[PDB]
Design a binder for this molecule. Structure first.
Ligand code: CLA
Ligand code: CLA
Ligand code: CLA
Ligand code: CLA
Ligand code: CLA
Ligand code: CLA
Ligand code: CLA
Ligand code: CLA
Ligand SMILES: CC1=C(/C=C/C(C)=C/C=C/C(C)=C/C=C/C=C(C)/C=C/C=C(C)/C=C/C2=C(C)CCCC2(C)C)C(C)(C)CCC1
Ligand SMILES: CC1=C(C/C=C(\C)CCC[C@H](C)CCC[C@H](C)CCCC(C)C)C(=O)c2ccccc2C1=O
Ligand code: SF4
Ligand code: SF4
Ligand code: SF4
Lengths: 73, 95, 74, 143, 80, 146, 742, 33
């Protein structure tokens, strides 16, 4: 939802990270994209391709994920 | 006969031939005290069914692991403490 | 834009190696030389030495020359 | 029904100070391939388990690890020392299967009394392709 | 275990079996050659797959032929 | 080769200095210096003896891929027989080591089959190729974003 | 007992066998049905144990082959001394050796390669050599180029003499087997007569020629002003003006009044602070004492007279309680087998080359060696590599003994049998300790790498986080620094200044071997070295022991020493041969010596070498980044490999450009080797048969049938290209790095 | 709780699911009928 507004200057986020081996410097360094915790930057472009086909909210992605789970079942 | 002069193929006693030996397996009786032995027997007979032991081990260990990692705060693991630091703006603005 | 290109090209290289490997597995397991005698596929296996030799030529030519040029420039 | 097995008795074993290439737990649950030979003199030979052994004048007996060990030993015996040998297979239950000549004659002299198996009466190119035997237990070479 | 096969191109030179270190092979009489003998493979259970037999078969391609197949403890050549 | 060409042409375009590629891509020491040695500057410094940054994961993955890419050379260069003999010694030791004689395997241990170990060497080799170049590409294009 | 048993005209000098290639072998002396024949013509060329069965002809062949090798080395030294004489700046390097690059090779201006002739210094354009011949020549008191040309001519003469000697001792009058087997006289002579008298004669040179000349060269004298060496022999007043003990001559010697010889035979251990090398005064006394020692040691073995130890009487005397008969039989398996002796001498000569590498950096014996960081690094690295190779060849030839020359019937040994009988125990414990060391030496690097990547530098194994200090090595270091005193009086200083209590030998702007501090990184890398050595010994010892038999192949000796396999059976039995074990041990020796010379280069450039200004502040080449960055692999990749490879790759258009060229080329040859190590023969034979169809289509079918390389040959080509490529990569990288920043 | 769910699922997955999976698969390997 933040990437949609300023995409050129807001970093994508693949998923958060909970690695209990992390030290506090690593918790501090991996906090990107305006997150309250560590994160990994989506170098997959899924942000761009979802934003180009609609999908301008997190609820849109939630509905899509639930529907794809239904499709997997 | 296995004990003859350089005979090691007693076909009847195939254990001595193939090397089936308790090399250190002393058959000496229980050196423990009887009372503490009975104590351990009665207090560890719950762990006699290997299948129930395995189910208990896996489920209780996973439960304790989730409990530790969910109730532990950031003082014992920095990943739950969080950033406690402002985020650096990446290259080229942030992209 | 780099991760996607690199991704799909390594994927394409693997998929291509697998395409050929499954053609080989076909030529062993599923190829009946009597049911396709003297056909495009059978006439193909005939001049396998010609194909292999001319592909060898192309690779040998390219590697020789282009490595020579890179080395000349080095 | 022309050559009976020999049923190795409690013969002496070669003089050997013991090695680590000997009989492991394979003998304790599977076969271990005893070999028997008959020496003219007390001579010294290389053991297939590594190390040097001193064979005894007269019959000997060695329980080494497996078939290739005793057959390599017996080939070295027959070639270097010119000595008749025969080896066995001793399952842990107790049975003793006779194996090396299985006819009293080594398996080079084509002596009649042995049935030919593993015998495809064709040249090696005339085997069918796998597609002709697809979805069948016979792979390529048992028709 | 392994499937050793002897084809009818064999000249009966007795190298396949004099090279075989596990008594898999044995020469038998035959009427297809000047030597009047051919190799057979009864004891394929003792076959390790070392292909010393077919590294000594002097024919166009081969007459003896070893096919790698279900590997057991004795075809894998294990003392343990 | 394809992706090295791509990444260098594009990182030079994005940085602005197409002349770097157009002058240095014609001789291999340009690729070894101006592409690999130069763009790996911000990566291997992902975690120095004094602190780390966001590219620590990419440096660790870089070295991880180097490691498996080297481990594949084990299964490729070394083949089956040295390892079977080594495992025979190991089996002797385990069956004659006290307090571990009580423990006996159920599957008789053997060195990996030749075709298997080939496959395993290629798996390590390709995993290392891929993870190494992913680390390098991602870290170089993310350390700067041109 | 001992004699000169030698037979005349055994072999005819004729080109008739040159015309018939492969004459030495039976299968090779009938024609090339295939191309593999030529590979077998070179492979078996020096396999004299396979050509013949009698040891007499083999001994003659190898004796004359050693003469050819000595001819080659005399010709090589001829080249070095000559190139120093004519194509060098040695006459100028003596003036300012701390700033002029030693150069002895010039290239021809043809294709732009004249850039290699660079500004070494001395008004001379050439290649900055890293051999240390200039340092020797300053230690030999040359002070000219005429002496070098005369030395080259004399070396060419001795090369021709050795060539004639090989011809004479094979074709004209060849010794028979009773002559070589008299090892008692051979040791008595090579100890006393080669090593004793050789060190004595070099002590004579060191006393008469090197010492008086270096007394002037170090005392600001120009080489043109120095008196010639023979003027010290002819005129003793000039020699006595610096060392008055020569005025008394040998009367101090023969009267045992040696106390009045200390002007030139010293014990003041340490480095000459005017040039950084050891005191030549100490080296003269050294080689003298070594002469005495080898001279009394070469009168140990009975040769013809009633005195002396018969080596059989020494070996048979040692018979262990539960070790059996003991060393009985060894005199008969060492004197009736060249391969056993070759293995023993190779192992010791290789470890000795390594000890040379280790003692030539920490006790620089030549002037201006420690300050020529290129020479120091290159010499250490060289001799380390030679030692690893010689040890690996010792393994190969132990295996060849065990396959061919080992006979428990006739030439029996007890201890070798006992080793063969628990070989599984040896290899099991070695295979364990290799894994233990691997873990607790390299997994520590992995732990440090992960902890530094997780932002946990307080959890590494560093000199700051978790102490793994070399307490034992630190104790030896501190007690060797405080060794001058109660334990070793009359030395005036430590025998080396690589210990913490030592001092800095400032030579010019350079530093020249101040103390070496041992920290956690040294612990980690030394256990890495123990690890790599132990794995190499695992592989090689395993090949040697299982050369004859295993549980897998019990008839491996009948298959030979050098065979690929025994088929895909038994799950696959590739590389069961001892040849393949040593082929793998080559790679592991490579990894070992590579990390060794990396440790050397980095520890030196960070903690030893550098530049010390006149104020006393020493700045090292890297900046002391070893103990902090050599705890994790990313430091070796970043601060050693990536950083120090900024002078070999940036050297394009410079004088050091062949170094970057061979950097890339050795990279290539290594990778090319991977085509051989990874692939197999069958693919290449099928491809060759396809392109042979393409040739037969054009009537270009060669009669020497194109065959893909044999399997063992593919492995040989792979390991040699792999080693050559990795080693030339490292050579170029080191030399450019260390010549550029110097 | 959403910030506490990785702390429950990552130790769950990456340690227990190996326990369950590798144990059950070793039992499936070492089986006889
Ligand atoms: C840097 C490493 C490297 C190099 C140089 C090669 C080179 C080659 N491979 Mg590949 N290969 C490699 C790694 C490499 N491979 C690896 C790691 C594997 C995995 C096992 C393979 C697997 C493989 C297969 C499976 C096949 C090849 C093929 C080929 C040939 C392709 C034809 C070509 O371009 O040749 C042009 C020539 C060269 C590249 C050689 C370069 C050297 C120069 C030109 C020689 C001259 C220099 C000098 C004057 C000689 C003297 C040197 C010294 C004695 C003084 C060629 C020889 C194919 C083939 O044979 O097709 C014909 C083929 O089928 N290779
Ligand atoms: C020049 C005169 C001469 C002549 C005509 C012969 C003739 C002969 N010699 Mg004798 N020999 C000579 C000199 C000579 N020798 C010398 C000087 C030595 C001492 C090294 C020997 C030592 C010697 C031994 C030990 C043996 C012979 C043998 C032979 C016979 C076969 C040699 C053959 O075909 O290989 C021809 C080989 C070559 C032409 C090349 C050999 C390599 C040379 C010596 C050195 C190479 C240096 C080179 C620079 C290094 C490579 C690096 C390069 C890549 C840069 C033949 C009767 C053999 C024999 O009779 O046994 C049956 C035998 O065993 N010779
Ligand atoms: C590939 C083989 C090879 C090559 C090319 C070189 C090349 C070089 N060596 Mg090395 N070396 C080698 C093998 C090799 N070495 C081995 C195997 C040994 C172990 C004996 C040595 C021991 C050695 C020493 C000790 C020194 C060199 C030096 C040198 C350099 C000057 C050459 C010279 O002759 O100066 C003249 C040679 C000397 C001054 C050496 C003195 C003689 C030694 C101490 C002993 C005598 C040998 C003995 C008779 C045989 C061994 C006896 C046995 C009991 C072990 C040059 C870089 C010298 C150097 O780096 O100078 C800067 C130097 O000091 N090397
Ligand atoms: C006591 C007479 C004597 C003297 C003065 C020297 C002097 C020297 N030796 Mg030598 N050495 C000698 C006897 C001697 N040696 C003997 C008898 C042996 C045989 C064990 C050695 C074995 C030896 C080795 C293996 C090495 C030296 C080295 C050195 C140098 C190191 C610096 C130093 O202070 O040496 C002090 C010397 C000692 C503390 C050794 C004393 C050994 C005692 C007398 C044996 C009992 C120096 C030139 C080193 C060298 O040349 O490196 C470039 C080196 O690596 N020496
Ligand atoms: C004192 C030293 C010494 C001596 C006398 C010998 C002598 C011998 N060795 Mg041993 N060996 C040595 C050192 C030594 N080796 C070392 C240091 C190693 C470690 C690698 C080995 C490893 C080794 C193995 C593994 C084998 C031998 C074998 C042999 C025998 C035959 C070799 C032959 O005919 O090849 C003649 C010469 C050649 C074929 C040329 C080799 C080509 C080299 C690799 C070229 C590349 C190296 C070069 C420096 C790089 C420059 C490249 C440039 C040209 C472009 C012979 C008895 C063989 C044997 O006994 O077989 C039964 C055998 O299998 N050796
Ligand atoms: C980097 C590449 C690499 C690595 C890691 C290894 C690893 C090993 N080699 Mg191999 N080898 C390689 C390349 C490599 N080799 C190549 C290229 C060759 C070609 C010649 C060989 C040839 C070769 C031979 C011929 C021999 C070895 C031996 C060894 C062993 C010694 C170290 C050991 O066990 O200690 C512990 C393990 C290591 C140091 C490896 C790194 C592992 C780290 C420290 C920890 C791993 C993580 C941990 C277990 C957590 C697991 C997590 C879970 C998710 C899985 C080990 C299996 C020797 C052997 O088997 O006997 C000991 C032996 O004889 N190797
Ligand atoms: C194949 C698709 C996929 C992949 C690769 C991942 C990957 C991941 N998930 Mg997600 N997840 C997925 C589908 C996926 N998820 C779906 C479909 C659901 C809804 C049922 C979830 C619900 C979910 C939760 C609630 C959590 C994760 C978490 C995680 C991480 C640790 C693994 C774990 O415990 O997952 C558990 C996932 C499942 C049991 C669902 C399997 C179907 C990892 C980054 C954890 C996390 O945030 O770590 C950062 C976490 O707490 N996942
Ligand atoms: C000791 C080293 C170590 C270890 C153990 C971990 C562990 C972990 N890290 Mg990592 N990490 C490390 C060092 C380490 N980290 C370092 C040094 C860095 C750089 C600073 C990072 C950076 C990092 C990031 C950026 C992220 C992690 C994440 C994770 C978690 C992944 C979740 C999981 O269960 O994966 C499960 C395992 C896999 C997915 C591996 C799949 C491949 C396997 C091997 C094949 C499976 C075989 C078969 C198909 C299935 C059969 C069953 C099988 C169990 C046998 C996990 C807790 C992620 C996280 O927190 O999300 C939850 C994440 O985003 N880490
Ligand atoms: C210019 C252009 C054009 C045209 C083009 C073209 C015409 C192209 C072509 C192209 C091509 C032409 C391509 C190709 C490709 C191929 C491939 C990629 C192949 C592969 C193969 C394989 C993989 C194989 C497999 C197998 C085998 C091995 C055998 C058996 C069988 C099989 C088949 C299975 C147009 C105008 C339109 C448009 C624009 C552009
Ligand atoms: C490439 C390769 C081959 C084939 C290598 C060939 C046979 C070498 C190529 C031919 C050489 C270069 C000889 C041709 C040069 C001749 C001297 C002819 C001269 C012609 C002019 C150049 C003068 C193998 O046989 C092999 C075997 C086992 C494992 C890996 C491999 C392997 O990787
Ligand atoms: S080796 Fe071949 S040709 Fe000779 S006997 Fe055996 S099967 Fe017949
Ligand atoms: S593969 Fe080996 S064991 Fe089998 S038949 Fe051939 S030689 Fe005998
Ligand atoms: S792969 Fe090569 S080395 Fe291994 S068994 Fe087969 S032929 Fe022998």
């Amino acid at each position: 939802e933040t990437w949609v507004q300023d995409p050129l200057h807001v970093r994508p986020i693949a998923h958060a990270i909970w690695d209990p081996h992390f030290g506090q410097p690593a918790v501090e360094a991996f906090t990107r994209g305006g997150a309250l915790g560590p994160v990994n930057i989506a170098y997959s472009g899924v942000y761009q391709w979802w934003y180009t086909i609609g999908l301008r909210t997190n609820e849109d992605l939630y509905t899509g994920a639930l529907f794809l789970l239904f499709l997997s079942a | 006969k296995y004990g003859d002069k350089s005979v090691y193929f007693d076909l009847e006693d195939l254990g001595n031939t193939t090397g089936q030996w308790d090399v250190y397996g002393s058959d000496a009786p229980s050196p423990y005290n009887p009372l503490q032995s009975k104590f351990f027997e009665t207090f560890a007979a719950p762990f006699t069914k290997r299948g129930l032991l395995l189910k208990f081990l896996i489920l209780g260990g996973g439960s304790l692991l989730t409990y530790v990692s969910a109730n532990s705060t950031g003082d014992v693991l920095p990943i739950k403490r969080g950033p406690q630091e402002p985020p650096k703006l990446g290259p080229r603005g942030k992209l | 834009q780099a991760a996607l290109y690199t991704h799909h090209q390594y994927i394409a290289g693997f998929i291509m190696t697998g395409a050929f490997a499954h053609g080989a597995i076909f030529f062993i397991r599923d190829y009946n030389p009597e049911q396709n005698e003297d056909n495009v596929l059978a006439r193909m296996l005939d001049h396998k030495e010609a194909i292999i030799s001319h592909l060898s030529w192309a690779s040998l030519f390219l590697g020789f020359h282009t490595l020579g040029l890179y080395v000349h420039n080095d | 029904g022309f050559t009976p097995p020999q049923l190795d008795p409690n013969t002496p074993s070669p003089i050997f100070a013991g090695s680590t290439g000997g009989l492991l737990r394979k003998a304790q649950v599977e076969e271990f391939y005893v070999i028997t030979w008959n020496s003219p003199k007390e001579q010294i030979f290389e053991m297939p388990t590594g190390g040097a052994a001193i064979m005894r004048e007269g019959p000997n007996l060695l329980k080494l690890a497996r078939k290739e060990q005793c057959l390599a030993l017996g080939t070295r015996l027959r070639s270097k020392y010119k000595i008749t040998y025969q080896f066995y297979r001793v399952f842990p239950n107790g049975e003793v299967q006779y194996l090396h000549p299985k006819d009293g004659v080594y398996p080079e002299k084509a002596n009649p009394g042995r049935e030919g198996v593993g015998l495809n009466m064709r040249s090696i190119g005339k085997n069918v392709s796998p597609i002709e035997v697809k979805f069948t237990g016979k792979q390529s070479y048992d028709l | 275990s392994h499937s050793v096969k002897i084809y009818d191109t064999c000249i009966g030179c007795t190298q396949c079996v004099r090279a075989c270190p596990t008594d898999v092979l044995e020469m038998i009489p035959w009427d297809g050659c000047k030597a009047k003998q051919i190799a057979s493979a009864p004891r394929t259970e003792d076959c390790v797959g070392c292909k010393r037999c077919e590294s000594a078969c002097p024919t166009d391609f081969l007459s003896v032929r070893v096919y790698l197949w279900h590997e057991t403890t004795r075809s894998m050549g294990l003392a343990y | 080769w394809v992706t090295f060409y791509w990444h260098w042409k594009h990182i030079t375009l994005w940085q602005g200095n197409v002349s770097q590629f157009n002058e240095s891509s014609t001789y291999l020491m340009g690729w070894l210096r101006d592409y690999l040695w130069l763009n790996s500057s911000q990566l291997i410094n992902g975690y120095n003896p004094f602190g780390m940054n966001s590219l620590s994961v990419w440096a660790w993955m870089f070295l991880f891929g180097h490691l498996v890419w080297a481990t594949g050379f084990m299964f490729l260069i070394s083949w089956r027989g040295y390892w079977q003999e080594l495992i025979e010694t190991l089996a002797w030791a385990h069956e004659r080591t006290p307090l571990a004689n009580l423990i006996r395997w159920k599957d008789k241990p053997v060195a990996l089959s030749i075709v298997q170990a080939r496959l395993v060497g290629l798996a390590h080799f390709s995993v290392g190729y891929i993870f190494t170049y992913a680390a390098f590409l991602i870290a170089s294009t993310s350390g700067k974003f041109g | 007992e001992v004699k000169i048993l030698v037979d005349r005209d055994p072999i005819k000098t004729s080109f008739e066998e040159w015309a018939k290639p492969g004459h030495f072998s039976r299968t090779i002396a009938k024609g090339p049905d295939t191309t593999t024949w030529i590979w077998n013509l070179h492979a078996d060329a020096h396999d004299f144990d396979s050509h013949t069965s009698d040891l007499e002809e083999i001994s003659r062949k190898v004796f004359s082959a050693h003469f050819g090798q000595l001819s080659i080395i005399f010709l090589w030294l001829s080249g070095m001394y000559f190139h120093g004489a004519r194509f060098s700046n040695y006459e100028a390097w003596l003036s300012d050796p701390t700033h002029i690059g030693p150069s002895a090779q010039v290239v021809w201006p043809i294709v732009g390669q004249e850039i290699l002739n660079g500004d070494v210094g001395g008004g001379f354009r050439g290649i900055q050599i890293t051999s240390g011949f200039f340092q020797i020549w300053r230690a030999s008191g040359i002070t000219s180029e005429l002496q070098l040309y005369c030395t080259a001519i004399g070396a060419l003469v001795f090369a021709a003499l050795m060539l004639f000697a090989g011809w004479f001792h094979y074709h004209k009058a060849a010794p028979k087997l009773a002559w070589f087997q008299d090892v008692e006289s051979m040791l008595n002579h090579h100890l006393a007569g080669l090593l004793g008298l050789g060190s004595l004669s070099w002590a004579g040179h060191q006393v008469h020629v090197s010492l008086p000349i270096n007394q002037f060269l170090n005392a600001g004298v120009d080489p043109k002003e120095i008196p010639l060496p023979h003027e010290f022999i002819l005129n003793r007043d000039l020699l006595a003006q610096l060392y008055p003990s020569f005025a008394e001559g040998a009367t101090p010697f023969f009267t045992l009044n040696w106390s009045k010889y200390s002007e030139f035979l010293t014990f003041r251990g340490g480095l000459d602070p005017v040039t950084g090398g050891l005191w030549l005064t100490d080296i003269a006394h050294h080689h003298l004492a070594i002469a005495i020692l080898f001279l009394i040691a070469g009168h140990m073995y009975r040769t013809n007279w009633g005195i002396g130890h018969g080596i059989k009487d020494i070996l048979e005397a040692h018979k262990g309680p539960f070790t059996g008969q003991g060393h009985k039989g060894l005199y008969e398996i060492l004197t009736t087998s060249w391969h056993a002796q070759l293995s023993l001498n190779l192992a010791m000569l290789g470890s000795l080359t390594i000890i040379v590498a280790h003692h030539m950096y920490s006790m620089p014996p030549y002037p201006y060696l420690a300050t020529d960081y290129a020479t120091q690094l290159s010499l250490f690295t060289h001799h380390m590599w030679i030692g690893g190779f010689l040890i690996v060849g010792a393994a190969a030839h132990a295996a060849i003994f065990m396959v061919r020359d080992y006979d428990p019937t006739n030439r029996y040994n007890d201890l070798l049998d006992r080793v063969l009988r628990h070989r599984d125990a040896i290899i099991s414990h070695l295979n364990w300790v290799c894994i233990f060391l691997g873990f607790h030496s390299f997994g520590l690097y992995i732990h440090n790498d992960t902890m530094s990547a997780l932002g946990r530098p307080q959890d590494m194994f560093s000199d700051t986080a978790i102490q793994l200090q070399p307490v034992f090595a630190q104790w030896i270091q501190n007690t060797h620094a405080l060794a001058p005193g109660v334990t070793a009086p009359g030395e005036t200083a430590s025998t080396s200044l690589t210990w913490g209590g030592g001092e800095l030998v400032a030579v010019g702007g350079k530093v020249a071997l101040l103390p070496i501090p041992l920290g956690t990184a040294d612990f980690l890398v030394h256990h890495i070295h123990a690890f790599t050595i132990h794995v190499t010994v695992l592989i090689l010892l395993k090949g040697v022991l299982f050369a004859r038999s295993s549980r897998l192949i019990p008839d491996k000796a009948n298959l030979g020493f050098r065979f690929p396999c025994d088929g895909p059976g038994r799950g696959g039995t590739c590389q069961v041969s001892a040849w393949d074990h040593v082929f793998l041990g080559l790679f592991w020796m490579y990894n070992a010596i590579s990390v060794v010379i990396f440790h050397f280069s980095w520890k030196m450039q960070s903690d030893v070498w550098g530049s010390i200004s006149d104020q006393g502040v020493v700045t090292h080449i890297t900046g002391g980044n070893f103990a902090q960055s050599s705890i994790t692999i990313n430091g070796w990749l970043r601060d050693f490999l990536w950083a120090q490879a900024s002078q070999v790759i940036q050297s394009y258009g410079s004088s050091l450009s062949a170094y970057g060229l061979f950097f890339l080329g050795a990279h290539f040859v290594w990778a090319f080797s991977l085509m051989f190590l990874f692939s197999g023969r069958g693919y290449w034979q099928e491809l060759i048969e396809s392109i042979v169809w393409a040739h037969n289509k054009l009537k270009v079918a060669p009669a020497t049938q194109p065959r893909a390389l044999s399997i063992i040959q593919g492995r040989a080509v792979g390991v040699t290209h792999y080693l050559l490529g990795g080693i030339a990569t490292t050579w170029a990288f080191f030399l450019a790095r260390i010549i550029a920043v110097g | 709780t959403f910030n506490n769910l990785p702390s429950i699922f990552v130790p769950l997955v990456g340690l227990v699911f190996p326990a369950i999976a590798m144990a059950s698969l070793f039992l499936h390997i070492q089986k006889n009928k």
